[PDB]
Design a protein around this ligand. Structure first.
Ligand code: CLA
Ligand code: CLA
Ligand code: CLA
Ligand code: CLA
Ligand code: CLA
Ligand code: CLA
Ligand code: CLA
Ligand code: CLA
Ligand SMILES: CC1=C(/C=C/C(C)=C/C=C/C(C)=C/C=C/C=C(C)/C=C/C=C(C)/C=C/C2=C(C)CCCC2(C)C)C(C)(C)CCC1
Ligand SMILES: CCCCCCCCCCCCO[C@H]1O[C@H](CO)[C@@H](O[C@H]2O[C@H](CO)[C@@H](O)[C@H](O)[C@H]2O)[C@H](O)[C@H]1O
Ligand SMILES: OC[C@H]1O[C@](CO)(O[C@H]2O[C@H](CO)[C@@H](O)[C@H](O)[C@H]2O)[C@@H](O)[C@@H]1O
Ligand code: SF4
Ligand code: SF4
Lengths: 138, 69, 81, 162, 30
């Protein structure tokens, strides 16, 4: 679009990213910092430049927009930041939340790791026949 | 400045998304309900798939004196 | 399960060990005593696909995960588009 | 004026694809396609139905009257209708049970005009079932029918051909 | 009338299929 033109992450064309299923459902988008005008690599096959603004490129699906790291941290910078856009608002605050850099401690959140019994002798197969009264819905 | 021609008629320009043809020939409601039954579409199709398709196949296969396979 | 592939081990230390894997694994959740004291097997897994890049590196000493999830979204396979 | 429009990948942002080159968005083409259901929904789907039914109609003749199973027919019921007044029928409900992937149940009547449209978020759907009926209803009377001024037209024919 | 038993290959091999490829597009929706 143009009458509102708010860009940041230079490109020109491409038959790569975003298409019909990013309106009709979910969106996904990455943002970042940078020093002085440098030419990058890109998801979807292409390649462009930087300088600033928000430095806020929008991306099809979130496996796509963290790869700016799997190389876009072999090119300096603490700060890179992707969220989740809808067609209307929030719940799922993607790189928002608490702390960041998957390998620190504030809280514990989810995970667990065990099931009922642990990795031990599950030569014990599947137990009860699935029946609505004995704790196997987890 | 002559080839500064002040863009020999700007145009306005961008014609538009605006308006480079009127529309569709006035031929219409010359079919109003004319051919309805898909213009009474109010529960159908089951009717046209026994009917039409029992007469693209009833007489369609049968024949009174072969002209065989 | 809905994503349930066990990569657990016993060290759950993550230095020169394992990090790789699109989003899924925001761990370092130190359980009150396991050496380099960071533990378990996952965080909130309702986010990403089905790798086994999950092990490939840093032990699971048993199995190692793969696809087993069945109940499988789309954001859970690249292609809901 | 410029090198090629104000030079652009898409309408605007270059993170959607389409790579608007020619064969995509040259005023040379994009106009040869918008009295019809390309950019904007003229009148309802009602009428477009038969220009669609019919044009596609009197096709499928020489295809199955000059390439027919045992071809070049000496049967007064071929060089036209014959059977093919079957394709339009095998597909004039190949459609209706796709307009069951459309429901959304209404009745506004806005094929008359108001304030220079947009139909706005006109993309995505925003054409309910009671629309896709009056089209695939225009299809039957466009298909079957469009098959006969094929057939009905004698055949004054050009041919050879080498 | 003479020689006419040809309806139990379309009603089956042809029309019965029409029904279900239509109908059973109930797997998509109904
Ligand atoms: C060259 C030939 C060849 C041959 C001889 C076969 C043979 C077979 N294939 Mg097959 N296949 C082929 C090439 C071939 N294939 C290729 C090139 C591909 C892709 C590269 C496939 C992909 C494929 C798949 C995925 C499968 C098969 C399966 C099969 C078997 C199922 C047979 C059957 O009766 O289904 C009958 C098929 C139908 C009834 C569906 C056809 C529906 C059409 C007619 C509808 C027309 C729509 C119409 C316009 C709408 C009108 C509306 C109306 C309905 C109201 C059969 C052994 C299947 C199998 O393994 O099952 C045991 C299945 O797994 N094939
Ligand atoms: C039926 C065919 C098939 C399909 C599905 C496609 C599909 C596509 N082609 Mg394409 N193409 C084809 C055959 C096909 N092509 C052939 C045989 C050629 C010749 C080599 C091309 C040469 C070509 C080029 C150069 C381009 C495309 C492009 C495209 C893409 C967008 C263009 C567009 O839709 O503009 C709308 C098209 C029209 C409105 C066509 C109107 C022409 C009619 C009126 C001719 C009438 C014939 C007349 C009676 C004689 C799209 C993915 C473009 C692309 O890569 O993506 C952006 C690119 O510009 N094609
Ligand atoms: C079928 C597919 C594919 C597609 C989607 C297109 C699409 C397009 N081609 Mg095209 N083209 C193709 C294959 C394709 N071409 C092939 C294989 C060739 C031979 C190499 C060409 C040779 C060609 C030429 C020379 C031109 C186009 C042009 C165009 C554009 C305008 C069409 C028009 O003017 O309608 C006209 C439609 C009619 C029905 C007119 C009636 C024609 C007769 C019956 C009278 C359009 C974007 C034009 C263009 O790009 O802009 C100037 C033009 O330059 N094409
Ligand atoms: C066997 C056929 C093939 C052929 C030769 C044609 C030929 C034609 N189609 Mg067409 N069409 C086809 C398959 C075909 N179609 C299919 C598979 C679809 C559905 C995917 C359509 C959906 C369609 C529409 C909506 C329209 C046409 C239209 C047309 C007419 C010119 C516009 C055009 O195609 O620009 C090239 C792009 C031309 C007679 C136009 C028309 O007025 O007739 C209905 C109309 O725009 N077609
Ligand atoms: C090569 C073309 C393609 C094809 C195969 C058709 C075919 C058809 N058009 Mg058509 N049309 C086209 C492109 C096409 N159109 C374009 C680009 C426009 C925009 C100007 C129109 C605007 C148009 C209108 C307003 C009408 C048709 C109508 C028709 C139908 C009547 C027969 C006729 O002589 O047309 C009309 C003559 C010309 C297009 C010349 C016929 C099914 C008529 C109809 O729907 O009912 C019979 C109706 O009058 N067309
Ligand atoms: C030889 C036989 C048989 C016969 C009698 C016809 C007859 C006809 N075909 Mg045709 N056709 C046939 C086989 C046949 N076709 C086959 C096997 C195919 C393969 C697809 C076609 C593909 C075809 C197309 C795509 C079109 C026709 C068109 C036409 C009609 C218009 C005549 C014309 O040139 O416009 C006269 C135009 C002016 C005077 C201007 C005409 C009634 C149409 C047509 O020709 O319109 C241009 C349309 O273009 N046919
Ligand atoms: C399931 C069984 C068995 C099999 C494999 C066949 C197979 C066949 N029968 Mg058949 N038939 C059967 C039992 C069977 N029949 C019985 C019990 C009867 C007496 C009611 C008939 C009366 C019959 C007639 C009159 C004809 C055939 C014909 C045929 C052939 C064409 C298909 C057809 O339209 O059948 C029609 C089948 C029926 C009218 C029987 C309906 C009974 C139901 C319960 C069976 C449906 C089971 C299904 C698989 C599920 C095909 C070789 C046709 C032929 O001769 O072409 C070469 C001919 O039309 N059959
Ligand atoms: C279970 C099915 C079966 C049956 C019964 C048929 C039957 C037929 N096929 Mg067929 N076909 C089949 C499977 C079958 N096919 C398969 C699996 C294939 C894939 C290879 C084909 C590929 C095929 C081709 C390529 C063709 C046929 C054709 C035909 C038809 C020649 C006789 C005929 O027209 O019937 C009698 C009834 C009618 C023709 C309808 C009658 C319309 C009139 C009576 C009414 C008009 C006035 C209003 C016949 C309907 C040929 C054809 O299309 O001819 C139509 C030919 O084109 N078939
Ligand atoms: C010509 C004619 C005729 C014939 C008839 C007949 C008898 C036929 C047969 C037919 C048949 C022989 C049929 C069968 C049928 C069936 C149906 C109609 C239903 C259905 C369906 C479906 C398709 C489903 C299936 C399934 C199931 C069960 C579930 C899911 C999946 C599956 C697959 C499993 C008569 C005289 C009579 C009438 C008139 C004329
Ligand atoms: C063959 C009979 C056709 C003559 C028209 C009378 C019956 C039409 C069938 C629809 C049944 C409702 O009867 C109706 O007819 C008129 C059309 O002329 C309607 O007028 C309108 O109705 C619709 C209601 O959203 C609108 O999409 C249209 O603008 C118009 O058709 C009146 O709302 C009502 O009187
Ligand atoms: O059985 C096929 C045989 O019958 C046809 C089918 O339309 O029609 C006959 O029916 C009329 C009715 O008046 C008779 O006068 C005459 O025999 C045929 O037109 C015919 O095509 C087929 O030959
Ligand atoms: S590195 Fe592998 S605990 Fe160790 S095996 Fe478990 S994730 Fe960390
Ligand atoms: S192993 Fe599974 S959870 Fe881990 S990154 Fe891969 S897909 Fe995600």
């Amino acid at each position: 679009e143009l009458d509102p033109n708010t860009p940041s992450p230079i490109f020109a064309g491409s038959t790569g990213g975003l298409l019909r299923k990013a309106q009709v459902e979910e969106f996904y988008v990455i943002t970042w910092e940078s020093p002085k005008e440098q030419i990058f690599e890109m998801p979807t096959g292409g390649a462009a430049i930087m300088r600033e603004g928000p430095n806020l490129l929008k991306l099809a699906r979130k496996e796509q927009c963290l790869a700016l790291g799997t190389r876009l941290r072999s090119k300096y910078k603490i700060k890179y930041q992707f969220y989740r856009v809808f067609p209307s608002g929030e719940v799922q605050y993607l790189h928002p939340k608490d702390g960041v850099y998957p390998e620190k401690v504030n809280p514990g959140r989810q995970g667990v790791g065990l099931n009922m019994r642990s990795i031990g002798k599950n030569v014990s197969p599947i137990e009860v026949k699935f029946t609505g009264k004995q704790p196997y819905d987890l | 400045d002559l080839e500064d021609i002040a863009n020999t008629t700007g145009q306005w320009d961008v014609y538009g998304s605006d308006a480079p043809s009127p529309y569709n020939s006035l031929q219409s409601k010359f079919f109003e309900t004319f051919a309805a039954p898909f213009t009474k579409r109010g529960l159908l199709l089951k009717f046209l798939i026994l009917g039409g398709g029992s007469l693209l196949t009833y007489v369609s296969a049968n024949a009174p004196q072969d002209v065989l396979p | 399960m809905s994503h349930s592939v066990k990569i657990y081990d016993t060290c759950i230390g993550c230095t020169q060990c394992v990090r790789a894997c699109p989003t899924d694994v925001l761990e370092m959740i130190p359980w009150g005593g396991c050496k380099a004291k960071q533990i378990a097997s996952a965080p909130r897994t309702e986010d990403c696909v089905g790798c086994k890049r999950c092990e490939s590196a840093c032990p699971t000493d048993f199995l190692s995960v793969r696809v087993y999830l069945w109940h499988e979204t789309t954001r859970s396979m690249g292609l809901a588009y | 004026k410029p090198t090629y429009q104000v030079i652009q990948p898409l309408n605007g942002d270059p993170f959607i694809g389409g790579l608007e080159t020619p064969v995509t968005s040259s005023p040379l083409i994009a106009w040869y396609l918008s009295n019809l259901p390309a950019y904007r929904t003229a009148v309802n789907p009602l009428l477009r139905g038969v220009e669609v039914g019919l044009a596609h109609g009197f096709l499928l003749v020489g295809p199955f009257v000059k390439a027919g199973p045992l071809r070049n027919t000496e049967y007064a019921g071929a060089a036209g209708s014959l059977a093919a007044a079957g394709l339009v029928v095998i597909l004039s409900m190949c459609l209706t049970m796709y307009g069951i992937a459309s429901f959304k149940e209404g009745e506004p009547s806005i094929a008359p005009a108001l304030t220079l449209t947009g139909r706005k978020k006109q993309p995505d759907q925003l054409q309910s079932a009671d629309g896709w009926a009056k089209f695939t209803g225009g299809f039957f009377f466009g298909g079957v029918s469009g098959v006969t001024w094929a057939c009905f037209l004698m055949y004054v024919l050009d041919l050879p051909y080498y | 009338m003479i020689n006419l038993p040809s309806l139990f290959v379309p009603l089956v091999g042809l029309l019965f299929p029409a029904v279900a490829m239509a109908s059973l597009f109930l797997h998509v929706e109904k």
